[PDB]
Design a protein around this ligand. Structure first.
Ligand SMILES: [Cl-]
Ligand SMILES: [Cl-]
Ligand SMILES: [Zn+2]
Ligand SMILES: [Zn+2]
Ligand SMILES: [Zn+2]
Lengths: 121, 121
């Protein structure tokens, strides 16, 4: 769910998830997908494509178990769909941290991002 | 859409909507979730629950017609879902204004991972 996701993003990036990634570029946010503006934006693109492969479980609503041992995300969930979901969320959190170096505030928006079409997932 | 909603909020509250409500508390904004922290947060909680009843339109992208007449929001949409979407946004704008007295700037960028679980709508 959004609780686990936001938590991972905070844990990995050290950033307020909503403020930094709730409306960034074409893919970070709640306005579907678009052609990635940069590395950070591409993380969010991969994340949303990752959601699309899931079988029946709800990425926004369904909770799942994970651990934070040795400052590392560990998906302990036994439920197969929830496990894949957790790995989806873990992967974007790591990807976003990995790309803080090129993070640019100019890609933030308030209404809608100017985007080209995204390649199909 | 976000355009109409933002303009309503500006018109009612007098505040820049992105800055003051884009990420307020637990329920205001993208990824907004969880138990309300105050009356303003509760406006946003109610707003999100209002959005859940909508049948066949997109609250984020779909545009609609409303007028600002004698400083009153007047929804003017024949399309039932758009009319209902307009009434959700009108209601949150009014609610936010009505609770300006306990608005808390510290909540502007509250860490949503800190929020408690929300009651169902
Ligand atoms: Cl968040
Ligand atoms: Cl989306
Ligand atoms: Zn703005
Ligand atoms: Zn809302
Ligand atoms: Zn707080």
């Amino acid at each position: 769910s959004l609780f686990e996701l936001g938590k991972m993003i905070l844990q990995e990036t050290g950033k307020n998830p909503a403020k930094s990634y709730g409306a960034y570029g074409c893919n970070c946010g709640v306005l579907g997908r678009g052609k990635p503006k940069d590395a950070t934006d591409r993380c969010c693109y991969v994340h949303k494509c990752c959601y699309k492969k899931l079988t029946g479980c709800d990425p926004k609503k369904d909770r799942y178990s994970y651990s934070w041992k040795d400052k590392t995300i560990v998906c302990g969930e036994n439920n197969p769909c929830l496990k894949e979901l957790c790995e989806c969320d873990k992967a974007v959190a790591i990807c976003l941290r990995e790309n803080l170096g090129t993070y640019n505030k100019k890609y933030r928006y308030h209404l809608k991002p100017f985007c080209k079409l995204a390649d199909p997932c």
